[PDB]
Design a protein around this motif. Structure first.
Motif: not given
Lengths: 149, 230, 208, 222, 214, 149, 223, 213, 218, 213
Positions: E136-155
């Motif tokens: 994730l590049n050059n964003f304001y605020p700091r509060e971001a969330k990253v979700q990882w999806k293998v074959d459409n199923a959450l990690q």
């Protein structure tokens, strides 16, 4: 005891002393002694050879052989300390050539000394520029009087 | 980015003193480097180190030149000089101005890695001979209608001493296809040079071509124009 | 003075060849050894310092070596812009001495030169002859007057090899006194070369 | 100010181990001031460790550290020592030397030293594998990088094209993997017309191990 | 110990504001309290001692306020060098404990992140594990969330990230989430996605590649 | 060897020091000594008597006699200087009682001392209210052991 | 211009503590003087110095009342106080809250010149008590002369304010000193003289006010 | 304690007279001595501080003499409003002690009292006693005899008298004699009278009231 | 604290002698240069002499050489100035003052508080105090001329220090007598001039003289 | 000697202002020069040494500049306690000479003196000598000028003056001039006048008395 300012202070600051401004530091009862200035890996230390008066000088006293060293660019020298083994020597400031920018130091050295270690620094870029180890090797072993080859 | 440039003169007599300046102008306060260097290149294409001068004005010369070299620095005007005395023909060379490579971390500092930025060079001939200014005679283009579609032309820059010469075609607007030759020494003692360019053949009627022969040691500057004759 | 040696002194290799220059010091010099590139008529540019670190804005094709006594500069894949002499400098003991230089010639296919002969102007009599874009460098210029070889009357000059073309050019000037020049008919420039199957001749004569 | 506080002695150790931190002091009378050690576990804030009186006659420790660390002086050598035995995972961090605020004042600290990192961890000094983060193909800006995985300890220094490419770069702080080993990534955002024609090499340098790798990062063979 | 606690904790503000941060102690202290400043990667520096006494050299806009348990640090007109984390110490009773901190960041217009997903090299898959990286590049605020999806199923449990320090010129952040899986877990599944929440995207944005052929 | 803070500073400022927050200043090997506090004309100094702990103490050491004075309303005292003749005795701040607002100061005084001069000030109305001359006269001469008539 | 005033109570049992309060009214900020005083006045009109409290709360009490007296500063409320323990009949006095005169230049300061502003003073009797409030009876009137008045009888302890027509009529008023009756209790008479042409017209209302016992009785005089 | 003595203790002097009070101390007191003025039912007012310095707002008729042990307050021209008691106070040694006072009476013409007798009221008819007040209103000097009668019968030990402190304007006094007697002892006798001797009356003037009429 | 306490000063006549002293504590006396500086009444600073660490070298200004001797005693921690053959030009305040660092000459901190030297053959004499009479609304000025005294100083106050406002005690002036003369005044309202009286307090402590003089209209 | 001269020797300045003062020498002295501060009635103190270097305990607002003959001291932000006399000293060669000084005072709007004149007493004429005094009270700046007249004739070489230290509260100077004459001389003449010139009065202002009344 002598009356000379002992260096426990940056050489940049002790040259500002009026008591040793252009003071005569003659000693006709002495001699030339050639020297090398080295890094820890036995290489040359290029700033220290370039910026020190050759020959250095052995003065003969009623006790223990004294060694004079002119050091060029005096106002740019910061830390200047001299060590025999791991025993710190007291360095006396004798003259400051205001025309030339030359500081003339003097340290008493032990009978038979071949070489002496130098912790120093300089004032470049508004920063202290350090030199952990600078060995001052002498062309021959240092003694009392003229009874050496 | 620091840049460096060397200033004259390029003729000196046997036994006189060679006196060059180096302006560090180009984004610095002249304490942008712990020391500064002078190297030269001889006609045999060999490099000799001359010596350094530090930020503090203390210097360290080559033991081979020691007794004859001298360097100061000048913070106000932002320069360092090389002075070389009792000169001979052994000293005919290209003198280079230089600045050490400094570590990319905490620097500048007392570091011996090599030299990263260099002046452009400046050639210095050593003899009695009086500066002469060049005759400039044209070289005559498309001497025919059997031209091959790309037709050649030039400027014979003759009868000068000493080196160098800048030949700049038009304003420097056309660098493409240009060949400035090395000069060759003559039985006179005088140097003679050719500088040619090769360009399309139906760009003669249209496009205008003039050489810019510059000669710095003599203050001469001719602009000879060149078309076919008829 | 620590002495440096570079092997080879000259080298000729093709485009996309793996090249290796050497540099030996007369003593131990640890990693205190830089590499420079002098392009023709340009100042040396630092390629490699500390024996194996690469310098800003220089191509990833140049490698280092060391530390000790014998050092090798490597060009992975040779390109036409690499022309010129490659120097070797030690910074262990003073003076920081260089090596003699390795001259790098680019090898390419055989191109014929384009021959042009330029007549003199009326204000004093030399006649220049240009050979524009050729390889290899061994070419021979024979001057003529009335069909007579001119041994002694001229001197030549050849450019350093092109940064793009990998070609050379030659300029040959035949100087004569005006009494010799205007008293004489045809001036030919016979050129021999490897890329020319029979010698090619360019000429003119007076007043035409 | 001429006041100087220069620490050394920090390094890597294992649980149950030993380390002596030092602190050189110049530009004030050393035997007239209190001296303090403060610490900083990576990411977290400040925690007071110890202080010691002018002539070595009184010492205080924090309840965590008591009976394992010893604070110490040498007024003649101008040094402050911290002898750390029986080291734990919770003792890993930056260790600041810090002088009292005035002659014989106890509590308030200025100035401090610049810190010495202390790492406690049973992982051997290993050097990184550099793996290329390849750039996959508005069509004006592409991102590429290097993944610097499975090294120990801190720090590493990543730069790009030998320093020439300083612009639009982001080297991220590392993360403690449950391997005990660190992993960091550096990324650079770059023009897309330049992907085929311009060359990107990242420069990984690890001082504690003697590992340097110059990895080339290029579009994937597709 | 005496517990020291700090209300503001993370606080956004621009160059010129009147900023107030507080500090609170579990017992009575008198004015036996100091304030400290520390920028990223640098040592700390004392600002205020004896609750309100200003330290020698420090500029005149730093107030000290309070006595007993509630305490206050007030910066009159903020500046670019003032952006730092800020700590309070009690010097009443040993241990002389610090506070958790108040971090001070530069406020800015809301900037959306550019997203890039990265396969693992083939040079990595020979050693036995695979790391998939999402930038994730050059964003304001700091509060971001990253979700990882293998074959459409959450990690979960299998990925860790790290954020850069606020940038010098554009006051932005960047985030790098690294997913660690075995080579054997990795070859089975085909589609690998990185879903991203931020207040600058009206929609949750996703980047994907398919292992093997483009 | 001295480890206590030497007062070279306003008394209001040195009481902020944590080294001496509610610090034990007991010294059993000592005695009471009564005292007056007086202006230059021989009258009493009303504030300096009224706000000083009665009595003072004489602390007996192996080298010279030491006097402890407890000064009430310490946050309000600015300058506090003590002289024997006009040679300035150094003043060691030993304790500051936080509840009661009392500083406890020590000064080594010479053997056979009858009285002692005090240059001082207080913080009233946001201004410095100076007291040029206060004589702390003792009930009897101060010697260092048990010999006091 | 600082004004000062005294808070009660005016009755104290022997042994138990006399506790009085002085509220600093005027220019205030209670660092408008370097110190503050208490003076009292015994029934023979003799004045005694009680003691001082400075700006910083340090005190200096008379060596003849040392073991018994006490003073605080309040500084948030604008007050300084007096406490006196182990009280006998000897302490039956009028107690006065006071402030120093300060110098010509850079005042206020630590100066011992005299006391310039003073409270109105508060009477404090010490007795085994009883503490009774007053019955108030008229005195019937009868050109020129024409006098009338309020007989304030059967009260303990002192003092009393007599005011006529709310303060508006103070011409000719005579508030007498009280007389100790052999009941144990005091008695006071208060008279005023006024024109004979003004009787059947004007209205005359006393303002009998008693502290310590909260009694305020107003009353007319016809007859 | 330093004892302060003041001479005279009492003083009758006329309007416009020169009056000089004195105050001595038991030891040296420098210039640290103030002078106060206390009027009737009133707090003291600083007149003079530091031996000879006048206070703000006080009229310039009060002086004071200089340093040592003998001190002096002078009223140049004495007026009706200077009635009261004049104290000195030292500020050399603690406690800052006071003098006895100098009470100052104003001499005046002899003047006849206005005399008024008052009944007991309808409102005190309720449980208790009858109190009969007699008043001598504006007179001088202070010596004045009062006499209560009950059908030409003399009295003793019913009546306590109270006398006014001297007026700041008239320089006159007043006097309040209260006869007090039981209610069943009151309804017995039929006329009550108050007889007044004084310098300003040729022979003694009386005032009766005769119950109710 | 670094301490420097001078004794020895006072009054002496042309030709005469005086030895000055300087006790030094709070530093290693045997490791610093010691200097004397002077200052004549009203005028500025002028360097007198200096002495090396062990009394090896001594330097004097030209005016002073031949007459003043500078000395040491490192075992007693004190500095001396032996002034013989003394002049009119020499009357001033005489500062002891130490080199600023170990074995540093010239630059001086700290100095001592000062010891007055007077050179004047005039005898100790008490002052005559004379009134400055105020003559006719809107604010009057009055005073006391304190005349014909020797030596310094005089401490004048007014109404026993209870009159501080608008009071200007002037600096004395040396008369060709050899003897000093000061003026002291005060600004006071006009309406408080025939009632409130004004009595100045001239105390001269080098003789037995203290005079209290009253100042009134004519 | 090496002579040290100083510009200006008096300087008017407010609290906040950015002040500079020079020191110049008759020869070349590298940077071997100090700056010293002396308040009134107090010993001097070292501010600057080696032309530039700041002595321990001095605040960061005092700068030091120059090398050779011309030297500068600069206080960037002026404070209440910086009003004092400042001295340079050369330390190149003996004798180690100081300069005359530069005096810094508080600035104020221009203010006229109240002029008063005082006769000799009858107490003093009995000696055989007579001092006539002039007072110039509360004026800014310091440069005033006192002209005495005996029967309208300028006096010359028979008067001395002195000036007070500047006031902390109203920043004003005061001056005293004492004309001293003998008894015979004084009683030969009649009108005695004091003329005062200044910036704040437009004509010089004359006060006078005639001898006898």
């Amino acid at each position: 005891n002598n009356t000379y300012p002992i260096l426990n202070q940056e050489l940049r600051e002790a040259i500002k002393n009026p008591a040793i401004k252009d003071k005569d530091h003659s000693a006709p009862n002495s001699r030339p002694i050639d020297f090398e200035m080295k890094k820890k890996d036995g290489t040359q230390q290029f700033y220290h050879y370039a910026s020190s008066v050759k020959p250095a000088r052995v003065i003969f006293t009623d006790s223990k052989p004294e060694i004079e060293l002119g050091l060029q660019s005096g106002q740019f020298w910061r830390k200047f300390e001299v060590y025999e083994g791991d025993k710190k020597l007291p360095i006396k400031l004798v003259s400051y050539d205001t025309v030339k920018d030359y500081a003339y130091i003097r340290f008493s050295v032990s009978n038979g000394t071949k070489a002496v270690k130098i912790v120093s620094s300089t004032h470049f870029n508004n920063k202290e520029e350090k030199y952990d180890y600078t060995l001052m090797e002498f062309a021959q072993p240092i003694y009392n009087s003229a009874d050496k080859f | 980015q620091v840049q460096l440039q060397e200033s004259g003169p390029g003729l000196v007599k046997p036994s006189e003193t060679l006196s060059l300046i180096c302006t560090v102008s180009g984004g610095s306060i002249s304490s942008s480097s712990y020391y500064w260097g002078w190297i030269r290149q001889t006609p045999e294409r060999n490099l000799e180190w001359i010596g350094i001068i530090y930020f503090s004005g203390t210097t360290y010369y080559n033991p081979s030149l020691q007794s004859r070299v001298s360097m100061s620095l000048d913070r106000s005007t932002n320069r360092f000089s090389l002075r070389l005395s009792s000169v001979t023909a052994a000293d005919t060379a290209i003198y280079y101005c230089a600045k050490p490579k400094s570590r990319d971390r905490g620097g500048p500092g007392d570091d011996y890695f090599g030299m990263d930025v260099w002046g452009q060079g400046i050639m210095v001939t050593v003899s009695s001979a009086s500066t002469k200014g060049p005759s400039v005679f044209p070289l005559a283009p498309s001497s025919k209608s059997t031209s091959g579609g790309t037709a050649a032309l030039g400027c014979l820059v003759k009868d000068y001493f000493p080196e160098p010469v800048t030949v700049s075609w038009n304003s420097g607007a056309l660098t493409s296809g240009v060949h400035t030759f090395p000069a060759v020494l003559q039985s006179s003692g005088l140097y003679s040079l050719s500088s040619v360019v090769t360009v399309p053949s139906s760009s003669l009627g249209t496009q205008t071509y003039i050489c810019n022969v510059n000669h710095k040691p003599s203050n001469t500057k001719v602009d000879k124009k060149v078309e076919p004759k008829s | 003075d620590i002495q440096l040696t570079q092997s080879p002194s000259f080298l000729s290799a093709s485009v996309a060849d793996r090249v290796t220059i050497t540099c030996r010091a007369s003593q131990a010099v640890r990693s205190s050894l830089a590499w420079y590139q002098q392009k023709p008529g340009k100042a040396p540019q630092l390629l490699i310092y500390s024996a194996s670190t690469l310098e800003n804005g220089v191509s990833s094709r140049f490698s280092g070596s060391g530390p000790g006594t014998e050092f090798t500069l490597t060009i992975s894949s040779l390109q036409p812009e690499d022309v010129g002499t490659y120097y070797c400098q030690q910074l262990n003991t003073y003076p920081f001495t260089f090596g003699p230089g390795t001259k790098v010639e680019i090898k390419r296919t055989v191109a014929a030169p384009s021959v042009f002969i330029f007549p003199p102007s009326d204000e004093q009599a030399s006649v220049v002859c240009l050979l524009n874009n050729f390889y290899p460098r061994e070419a021979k210029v024979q001057w003529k007057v009335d069909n007579a070889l001119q041994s002694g009357n001229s001197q030549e000059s050849v450019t350093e090899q092109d940064s793009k073309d990998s070609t050379y050019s030659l300029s040959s000037t035949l100087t004569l006194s005006k009494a010799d020049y205007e008293k004489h008919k045809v001036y030919a420039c016979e050129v021999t070369h490897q890329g020319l199957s029979s010698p090619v001749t360019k000429s003119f004569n007076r007043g035409e």
